[PDB]
Design goal:
The complex is a heterotetramer, with 2 copies of chain A, 1 copy of chain B (about 210 residues) and 1 copy of chain C (about 210 residues). Chain A is built from 3 helices and 15 strands. Chain A has about 190 residues and is mostly beta strands. A 5-stranded mixed β-sheet of chain A has the order 2-3-4-7-6. In chain A, strand 6 and strand 7 form a beta hairpin. Chain B has 2 domains: about 90 residues, Immunoglobulins (Immunoglobulin-like), CATH 2.60.40; about 100 residues, Immunoglobulins (Immunoglobulin-like, Sandwich). Helix content of chain B is about 10%, strand content about 45%. Chain B is built from 4 helices and 16 strands. The N and C termini of chain B lie far apart (about 60 Å). Chain C is mainly beta. In chain C, strands 1, 2, 4, 5 and 6 form a 5-stranded antiparallel β-sheet that branches. In chain C, strands 9, 10, 13, 14 and 15 form a 5-stranded antiparallel β-sheet that branches. The longest helix of chain C is centred in the N-terminal third of the chain and has 6 residues. Chain C is elongated. Classes of the chains: A mainly beta (about 190), B mainly beta (about 210), C mainly beta (about 210). Chains in contact: A-B, A-C, B-C, B-D, C-D. The interface between B and C is medium-sized, with 31 and 33 residues. The complex binds 2-acetamido-2-deoxy-beta-D-glucopyranose. 2-acetamido-2-deoxy-beta-D-glucopyranose binds next to loops of chain B.
């Protein structure tokens, strides 16, 4: 029920480049029944899909929001398709240095720039660090778990065996509410 | 001549890559393509086009309903009634976007070992299967550059062998230089289908 | 209704696996299908059999003459001419056909299942590819071990022209889906391809987990 | 490269049949000359493609046939090519095999039998290769290349590359057993 045949795909995805765009605006459009927002940034056309609760939250569209984009693919028309990653237009900002414990035991850290961060950004940045320094998605390393531990004991978990589910990429967290992150790498 | 009415879904190519899409209601079999009136299911003004012969003589006229992408994608049911003096009672045709859709499973297959030993051209095979409806697009990339249509061959979408619900499959072969494959650059098959979450998906391969 | 004459070649399946392959000469676009006369060349085989009137794709009438026992002169390279006379024709129509002489045999390849499917332990897809052949006509059959599989369990796509760099060649793919456990256990699976340019008419590629 | 080693192992390890007193009219099949005959509850399709197409222009009228299956077609007919020998005792033919045991050249004297005076190249090739397969690891792992060399009294010689199945057009060639002097095999180490 668990295998290593998609290892190259996960490694390619979570080692690829991400972008953090500010003040993004655009109206919502119907594309194949989906709610999308097309915008141009760095001389590149983007197609943001709103598929989770971000669909309800950005009914009107984006009016200057922050967007964390990751290329799902570039469609035949040159548009970069990206999912979720929208956080609010914020007039306040601070640094949160998040302790990242990685068990295979090793203390790491993870610096977040905004007061509202998307689960997409947390997932992608954590996995990229795991790919580049801890051997994730290489050889027999694929499965494991990211555990985002919030203040008070509540936790939010991500399975490393698959890409984060598109519907979860629009979920957001308050950076101040993060207590620490634990990763467990279960290798064979 | 034997008047027949058929209504055609918006081309998938237009829905997924065009800025416009239209339903097309065609009345074929007309001995005199005059006095055809179309009226449908309350939106934008539908343009009739010119008359045109079909096969084995006879004529035909069509009515395109422009700007139908959004209503189509919303789940709207369209109805087209065509009235003509060569039929007794005007004919009707209904059509709506499909439920019971299934995502394609997309696979890209390496070249046969024999061809790698030939060292001339190697065949890459893309397979999309398990999807419904049968309408699908297939494109190829080498690296991040899209290849022209003329360099590959996409078969028609055909129904799979299945005990149970109906699914479709499509193959596409792209033949490339053995040297390009062996030097290690990537190749990708891109598939468009209305049941995919992002409308398109992609599989990439290399040695 | 406009009359047209068409001469169709013997079915490949009959030439390679039947006793009785035949050419079909069809006169379509008739208002009244009686009164047709068909004259065949060469005239030295079994008697021609004219079929009953048929409707074509536009309410007109169609009648066809089949020349049975044609496999021998077809394979010998003789050219067949069919001449049709009908009251609805000012003058008789002629159609000519022969076995092609600029032919290429198929390159046959049997591809293993996609890696992803090998994780699902449900069904796995085997792909047979026959390419580089001419003429278009081709047969594809599947075997598991030494047993032929029924065609309810694979689907062969239509023969299509390849992207070309001069000479016209064609290609076909065929999709067979087998139980994963049969595939992992070590069974062999064979694609069998039939084509008139093949030395023995048929060839076979066999595959299992390397 | 070694991509077809398994196809070669299947073919040259498959069962061969030595039939005698075979008759049959020539028929046209897919443009080629074939002779169909039934032996041991099996329907056979014999292809005459070499010069035997001219030799057996009428068909067979009591000849010996050495049958190797290329495939069983969908009608159940075993397709085989050539291997026809004259219509008119055992002989033990000797065989030198040069293999590479890691770092040592090991020469082995071996042999195999034939039951006829005039013998076809198809029979010699198939029987030689079968024992190379069975006793010397040919078409296993990495062993696929090498050469069979058949020397004849007087000096005339014939070669057969092991990397390829014997050419179809060479399966109607025939020899006399008594004229065979040496037969030497080198198993090329890849
Ligand atoms: C309607 O859509 C079809 C879909 O391919 C297109 O070919 C045609 O040009 C379109 N015509 C109009 C008037 O929109």
């Amino acid at each position: 029920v668990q295998h290593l045949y998609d290892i190259k795909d996960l490694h390619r995805y979570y080692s690829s480049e991400s972008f953090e765009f500010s003040n993004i605006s655009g109206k919502v459009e119907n594309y194949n029944g989906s709610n999308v927002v097309r915008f141009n940034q760095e001389k590149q056309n983007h197609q943001l899909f709103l598929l989770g609760e971000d669909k309800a939250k950005y009914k009107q569209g984006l009016q200057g929001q922050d967007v964390f984009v990751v290329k799902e693919l570039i469609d035949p028309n040159g548009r970069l398709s990206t999912v979720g990653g929208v956080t609010k237009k914020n007039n306040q900002s601070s640094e949160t240095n998040i302790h990242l414990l990685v068990n295979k035991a090793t203390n790491d850290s993870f610096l977040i720039n905004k007061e509202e961060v998307s689960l997409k950004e947390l997932d992608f940045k954590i996995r990229k660090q795991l790919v580049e320094k801890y051997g994730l998605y290489q050889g027999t390393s694929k499965y494991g778990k990211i555990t985002i531990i919030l203040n008070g004991g509540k936790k939010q978990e991500i399975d490393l065996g698959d890409k984060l589910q598109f519907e979860r990429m629009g979920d957001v967290l308050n950076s101040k509410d993060i207590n620490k992150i634990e990763v467990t790498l279960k290798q064979i | 001549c034997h008047p027949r009415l058929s209504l055609h879904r918006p081309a998938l190519e237009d829905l997924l890559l065009g800025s416009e899409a239209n339903l097309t209601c065609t009345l074929t079999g007309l001995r005199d393509a005059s006095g055809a009136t179309f009226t449908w299911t309350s939106g934008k003004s539908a343009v009739q086009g010119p008359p045109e012969r079909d096969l084995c003589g006879c004529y035909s006229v069509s009515s395109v309903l422009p700007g139908s992408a959004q209503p189509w994608n919303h789940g709207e049911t369209f109805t087209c009634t065509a009235a003509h003096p060569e039929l007794k009672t005007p004919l009707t045709a209904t059509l709506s976007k499909s439920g019971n859709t299934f995502r394609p499973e997309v696979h890209l297959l390496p070249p046969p070992s024999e061809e790698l030993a030939l060292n001339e051209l190697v065949t890459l095979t893309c397979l999309a299967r398990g999807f419904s409806p049968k309408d699908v697009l297939v494109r190829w990339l080498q690296g991040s550059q899209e290849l022209p249509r003329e360099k590959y061959l996409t078969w028609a979408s055909r129904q799979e062998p299945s005990q149970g619900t109906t699914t479709f499959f499509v193959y596409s072969i792209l033949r490339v230089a053995a040297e390009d494959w062996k030097k290690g650059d990537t190749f990708s098959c891109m598939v468009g289908h209305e049941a995919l979450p992002l409308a398109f998906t992609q599989k990439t391969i290399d040695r």
